[PDB]
Design a protein around this ligand. Sequence first.
Ligand SMILES: [Zn+2]
Lengths: 49, 397, 397
Amino acid sequence: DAGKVVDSETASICDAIFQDEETEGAVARFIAEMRQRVQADRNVVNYPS
Amino acid sequence: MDVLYSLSKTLKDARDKIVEGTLYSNVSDLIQQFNQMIITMNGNEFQTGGIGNLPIRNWNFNFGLLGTTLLNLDANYVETARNTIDYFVDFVDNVCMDEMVRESQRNGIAPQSDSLRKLSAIKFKRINFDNSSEYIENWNLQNRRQRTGFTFHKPNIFPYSASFTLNRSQPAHDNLMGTMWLNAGSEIQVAGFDYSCAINAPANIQQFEHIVPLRRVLTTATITLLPDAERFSFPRVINSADGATTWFFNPVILRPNNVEVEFLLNGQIINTYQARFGTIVARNFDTIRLSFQLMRPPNMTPAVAVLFPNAQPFEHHATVGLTLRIESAVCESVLADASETLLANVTSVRQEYAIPVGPVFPPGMNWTDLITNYSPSREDNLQRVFTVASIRSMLIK
Amino acid sequence: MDVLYSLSKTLKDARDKIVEGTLYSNVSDLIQQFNQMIITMNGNEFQTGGIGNLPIRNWNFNFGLLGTTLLNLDANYVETARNTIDYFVDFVDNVCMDEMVRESQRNGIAPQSDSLRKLSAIKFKRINFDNSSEYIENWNLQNRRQRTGFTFHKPNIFPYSASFTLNRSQPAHDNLMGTMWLNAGSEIQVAGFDYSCAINAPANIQQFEHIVPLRRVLTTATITLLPDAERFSFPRVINSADGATTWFFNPVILRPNNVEVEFLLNGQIINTYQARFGTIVARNFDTIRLSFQLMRPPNMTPAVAVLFPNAQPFEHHATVGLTLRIESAVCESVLADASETLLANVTSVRQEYAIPVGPVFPPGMNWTDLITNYSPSREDNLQRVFTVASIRSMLIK
Ligand SMILES: [Zn+2]
């Protein structure tokens, strides 16, 4: 869903865990589905980390 | 409690939806939930039983996950899943039985079994799934202090009570006025009788009242009110008040007069039905008040006149009656009805495993005694045991 | 309710701790709390009153924050703080009075005033502060469905009842056996009398029993038991059971014999004391059964033997009494006691503003009736009004 994460370290860690074979299917699907939320009307942003 | 319910629910969904030939998309989310349950449970030891004759059993979890790839599930997949599901079902069964067989005076709402106390830990919260059953919904609502509600068909709200009251009496018991009643389950049958047929009463009318206070408030109750009590319409030989002797009762039934049924809450007349029979509704009430009268007929044909003399010998005794059934109702507290099997399940487990009489429930889970003294502690323990029993019934037939 | 309590608590802390000269390290955190309260309440409009004669008042909140750059706060700081404290205290006062003067048959725990409904919004939750008071503690506990406990100094648990039972009587009322009792607040005072002094009773012993059922389960109660009932030990002229006549009671007091005071919980005997007086402990009970006996003195000096003849005329009537006082106790539900003033505050507000009688509480908050019929809805509304009354008393006398 064209998601974003809060730091380059976070992105790299997510890539590593997504690729590794010992990850839970739930964790993999969550790393794939996790989304940020940018509310300009309220001047707020939430990012996964 | 919610964790135990969620284990039962995910196991039921696994035994139902995980079937041969089903699409992977039908069970993707269910398999996610199933693997969550397995991962959470693995590495834990549980101990169940040890009370009465319920055996002590130990449960150890090291199971493999389910890897769904086949486009349509095949026999191998179903067999592998059933291996895990059977063990988990046995575990849930034992946990539910061990929780049902226990009780406490203080903190009766909280888990009593050590297995359920352990399942209350924070780490098992990951299995919660969805709380859709009526009892679990009401459990959560009560825990948050929201107005709950249980819908009962023929609620067992009246403690069994078959009795009589003589307002006029004498040792001969040959000239009596009074009332007789049976309160049982969801039925009230009352009958006022007068041997003189109100010949000497003021206005040739005898008044009768029957007040029944319910141990809990019932709401949106559908009631059937019929104008005669069949249970007190035949000859009887009844023991005296003190059991010294017996007296003979030979009724002849007249229509009840000036019938008024009042459903009251906090001493206020919430509903009042005057001379109306059939199906009525009581929206909210904690006490029922039946009022009726025996009116001596002002005109009598010779056959009727022969029955009601003015001298002492009263071979036939005038009687009026009312029957009142609560076909359905709603109660905030847990009750026993004629449709649910939760009381039967709890009592059956206790009887089968010979659980010693505890400090809260009466011996044998006697419903009459329980409802006669339905204390708050008894209500808490009963709600807990009923909720876990309904959890158990999702997997045990 | 928690937000209302927190507004009152922060206002009390501000009015106690913001005094000229005090170091700012003594009020740093309090000023943070006060500024957050101001920020949250700012830009809000509330309306209070409009029930009975309670004035309709409007509250607009627009206040500047309190300063933070000061070592020892001075007269300017105190003045600027007190100007705001006065307005906030008045607002809390009116919100509490509005809450107290309202009741609801359904959801008596839910806020009734629209001001408190507003404060229930999640925006105001930031002002929660610390819920350290007993009543707010119990409010939170019962919201979570946890055990609640209120400690009372001689709780008002017995509904007022001054009455007498005549187990033996006749129209002349010159040969009477039975009991008199006064239950009131925390004192039971019972006295069994026999005009014949058990002359014709088996073993020359007359048995008296007195069962007092409480509406709520008391725990860890200290009870003073004394062997005489000073209230029923002087000559009386009592009107008959049906008010037709009056009968004379001329008592002479004997020691009660085979005294047994037992405290029962759902019919089971939790505590029992045999012929023991002074201070005793009832750990958990909801009924009190007092059994005692008039034993005709086996040996009598002539001045006593004259008093009790064999024939009918019984000038003096043997009487044996007990007095029981619950000095202190703990109850799950809310009650009125000697020390607290919550019942008084609620009744005072209702009387002062001429609040029409609602559906739940009896007229004038009659405690006798309120405790005689202590329904669940009444308990919910009473707990709500008592909690808000304590919140109010935290600021107003
Ligand atoms: Zn049916």
